[PDB]
Structures are given as structure tokens and as C-alpha cells.
From Swiss-Prot:
It comes from the Eukaryota. Belongs to the GW182 family. Interacts with one or more of the argonaute family proteins AGO1, AGO2, AGO3 and AGO4. Interacts with PABPC1 and EIF4G1. Interacts with CNOT1; the interaction is direct and mediates the association with the CCR4-NOT complex. Interacts with PAN3; the interaction mediates the association with the PAN complex. The chain holds residues 1134 to 1205 of 1936 of the full protein. The silencing domain, also known as C-terminal effector domain (CED), can act in autonomous repression, including both translational inhibition and mRNA degradation. It comes from Homo sapiens (Human). This is Trinucleotide repeat-containing gene 6C protein. Plays a role in RNA-mediated gene silencing by micro-RNAs (miRNAs). Required for miRNA-dependent translational repression of complementary mRNAs by argonaute family proteins. As scaffoldng protein associates with argonaute proteins bound to partially complementary mRNAs and simultaneously can recruit CCR4-NOT and PAN deadenylase complexes. Residues 14-59 form the UBA domain.
Length: 85
């Protein structure tokens, strides 16, 4: 036995660049950089990721390289298109 039931709903919260700023940070933070700089550069990088990242790495030369998570190139598909003439 299980009858229908209602609950609470919501919508996209106020649209403020402030809260958004984090979004971009989440990434930089995932890589291996503090929010301190990622928050300073970004604002100066016109809210850019690639731009900031490079601006944060340019500082010190590390061994590791850039990349987004798995960053595993994709583009395969079993298919064949033979010609006739």
C-alpha cells in the first residue's frame, strides 16, 4: 500500500555572479590550487578558467600538467563507409 504524496519545491535561486564565482573555483580547487588565488585571478581573468589556471601555474613550475579529471580524449565509433566509384 502506497498512496500519492506531495512535498516542498523550489526554483533557481537568485542570479548573483557572487555565488557563481564559486562554480569556477570548484574546478581550480579540484585540480590542486587554493581558493585564495583562484578567487583573485578569476575576477581578474574575466571569470576565465584556462586564463586563470595558466596565471596560477605560471607562478611556479611544477612537474604535473594541466587537465580536467579523466581528461580522456573521446571519439570512437564502430562504423565503415566503403566507396564504389
Amino acid at each position: 500500500g502506497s498512496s500519492g504524496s506531495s512535498g516542498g519545491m523550489k526554483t533557481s535561486g537568485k542570479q548573483d555572479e557572487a555565488w557563481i564565482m564559486s562554480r569556477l573555483i570548484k574546478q581550480l580547487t579540484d585540480m590542486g590550487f587554493p581558493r585564495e588565488p583562484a578567487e583573485e585571478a578569476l575576477k581578474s581573468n574575466n571569470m576565465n578558467l584556462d586564463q586563470a589556471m595558466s596565471a596560477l601555474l605560471e607562478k611556479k613550475v611544477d612537474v604535473d600538467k594541466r587537465g580536467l579529471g579523466v581528461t580522456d580524449h573521446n571519439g570512437m565509433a564502430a562504423k565503415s563507409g566503403p566507396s564504389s566509384g
